[PDB]
């Protein structure tokens, strides 16, 4: 039906809000901050 991730590796560091994959922690940490405030990029609306 709706294929997807049959067998894909994972990263040692993953976000908490968007759950994004990262190689280094430093890069991740800095990426976590961006997740602040409200409607930073734009609402989904569907
Ligand atoms: Zn994130």
Curated annotation (Swiss-Prot):
It is found in: Cytoplasm. A zinc finger (C2H2-type) spans 13-35. Overexpressed in ovarian cancer tissues compared to normal ovarian tissues. Isoform 1 and isoform 2 are expressed in squamous epithelium tissues. Isoform 2 is overexpressed in squamous cervical cancer (at protein level). Expressed in blood cells. Isoform 1 is expressed in pancreas, lung, skeletal muscle, heart, placenta, liver, kidney and brain. Isoform 2 expressed in chronic lymphocytic leukemia (CLL) and several tumor cell lines. Isoform 3 is expressed in several tumor cells. Isoform 5 is expressed in fetal liver and several tumor cells. Transmembrane segments: none annotated. Induction: Down-regulated during erythroid differentiation by GATA1. Down-regulated by HTLV-1 Tax through the CREB/ATF pathway. Up-regulated by the regulator of nonsense transcript UPF1. Up-regulated by the cyclic AMP-dependent transcription factor ATF4. Belongs to the krueppel C2H2-type zinc-finger protein family. Involved in the regulation of antiviral interferon signaling. During viral infection, recruits SETD4 to TBK1, leading to TBK1 monomethylation, which is critical for the assembly of TBK1 complex and IRF3 signaling. Interacts (via the KRAB domain) with TRIM28 (via the RBCC domain); the interaction increases ZNF268 nuclear localization activity. Isoform 2 interacts with CHUK and IKBKB; the interaction is further increased in a TNF-alpha-dependent manner. Forms a ternary complex with TBK1 and SETD4; the interaction between SETD4 and TBK1 is ZNF268-dependent and leads to TBK1 monomethylation. The KRAB domain functions to reinforce the nuclear localization of isoform 1 in addition to its transcription repression activity. This is Zinc finger protein 268. The gene is ZNF268.
